[PDB]
């Protein structure tokens, strides 16, 4: 458990010099003790596979995750939460590589497992819905997409905080779906909603004193890492609309917040 937390810790810092050998060594050490087909081998493989994915070693990552999937199916059951977790990792990997059709069943299997085990209103079920919706969106299957995103947003808002990062992540993902469809106004709304609860977290309820960056942007026109992107998004949208003084406002406010869409997958 401690060994796993340390591997995760170096991987967070992107310090792959340390992360990989330790992992390769724990894998070697574990195989000697209990053989290859063991839950702990699958755990270290899963961690390593994700390090390879962050290094853009996609082929190697896919191999480890399948190997890890095979073991977990063998040692824990075909419908175990750990299996769902590994499928959600393959689906994310295929999706980020544009193999949406291949990812789609993996994501659906994980969802069926997660629902059965964790219950239909669990944040992990929501995480999954967001990935399914975004995977389907990239295939133009918009019919279910909006439903899944709202079901996931409902879960993340009730079960987690309204200031939880997943809430803003799911909102940007649904906004991207709206953008594909030409629903620019509906996306503009979600960007504004995200940027409002963000301001209200720093300097309370919006009145004539505490107005968010976008209200100032619209005024100029007339005359968290998940927030910096939303600022780049609404700035891009205002620019798309030909509202350049409002665009420059947010574009400058994005550069400040850092010190066109991005598909946020949840793992």
């Amino acid at each position, epitope marked *: 458990r401690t060994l796993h937390n340390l591997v995760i810790q170096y991987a967070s810092q992107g310090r792959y010099e340390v992360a990989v050998p330790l992992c390769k060594q724990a894998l070697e050490d574990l195989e000697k003790t209990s053989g290859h087909d063991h839950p702990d081998v699958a755990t270290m493989l899963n961690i390593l596979a994700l390090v390879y994915r962050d290094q853009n070693k996609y082929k190697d990552a896919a191999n480890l995750l399948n190997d890890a999937l095979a073991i977990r199916e063998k040692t824990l059951g075909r419908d175990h939460p750990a299996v769902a977790a590994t499928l959600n990792n393959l689906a994310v990997l295929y999706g980020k590589r544009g193999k949406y059709k291949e990812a789609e069943p993996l994501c659906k299997r994980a969802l069926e497992i997660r629902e059965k085990v964790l219950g239909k*209103d669990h944040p992990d079920v929501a995480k999954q819905l967001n990935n399914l919706a975004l995977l389907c969106q990239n295939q133009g299957k918009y019919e279910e997409v909006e439903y899944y995103y709202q079901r996931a947003l*409902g879960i993340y808002q*009730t079960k987690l905080g*309204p200031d939880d990062p997943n809430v803003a992540k799911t909102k940007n993902n649904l906004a991207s779906c709206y953008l594909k469809q030409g629903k620019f106004k509906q996306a503009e709304t*979600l960007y504004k909603e995200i940027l409002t609860r963000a301001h209200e977290r720093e300097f309370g309820s919006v009145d004539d004193e505490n107005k968010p960056i976008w209200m100032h942007a619209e005024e100029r026109e007339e005359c968290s890492p998940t927030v910096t992107t939303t600022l780049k998004n609404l700035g891009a949208l205002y620019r798309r609309q030909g509202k350049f003084e409002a665009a420059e406002t947010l574009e400058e406010a994005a550069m400040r917040s850092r010190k066109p869409t991005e598909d946020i997958y949840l793992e």
Partner: nanobody, 112 residues
Framework: VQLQESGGGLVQPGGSLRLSCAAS????????MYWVRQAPEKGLEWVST????????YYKDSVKGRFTVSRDNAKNTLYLQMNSLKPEDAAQYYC????????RGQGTQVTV
């Protein structure tokens, strides 16, 4: 978290009712709000969704064009205008912070 439903009653097919949902114990204007229902021997069903503002509203296929979700963030109240009622709609109505009624109150009875 407190959610209290009201606005139910008996009406004739094609009739109208307005559901109210008072809230306290949470930042209401920082939440999306959901309307759910439950017919006697049937399972709990999602009816409507509303954003933090009023800009984004969603409805179950069967209620579309007949129902309208609204909210008064200052009054901390959620509303559901139920016009042109059908007996399919006759159920128990609850307001929640998600589909499948999490944090739902005692609800309000709607008869057709």
């Amino acid at each position: 978290v407190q959610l209290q439903e009201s606005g139910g009653g008996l009406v004739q097919p094609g009739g109208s009712l307005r559901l109210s949902c008072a809230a306290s114990g949470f930042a209401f204007s920082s939440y999306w709000m959901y309307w759910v229902r439950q017919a006697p021997e049937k399972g709990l069903e999602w009816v409507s969704t509303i954003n933090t503002g009023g800009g984004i509203t969603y409805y179950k296929d069967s209620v579309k064009g007949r129902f309208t979700v609204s909210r008064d963030n200052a009054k901390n109240t959620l509303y559901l205008q139920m016009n042109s009622l059908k007996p399919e709609d006759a159920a128990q109505y609850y307001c929640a912070t998600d589909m499948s009624g999490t944090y739902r109150g005692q609800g309000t009875q709607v008869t057709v």
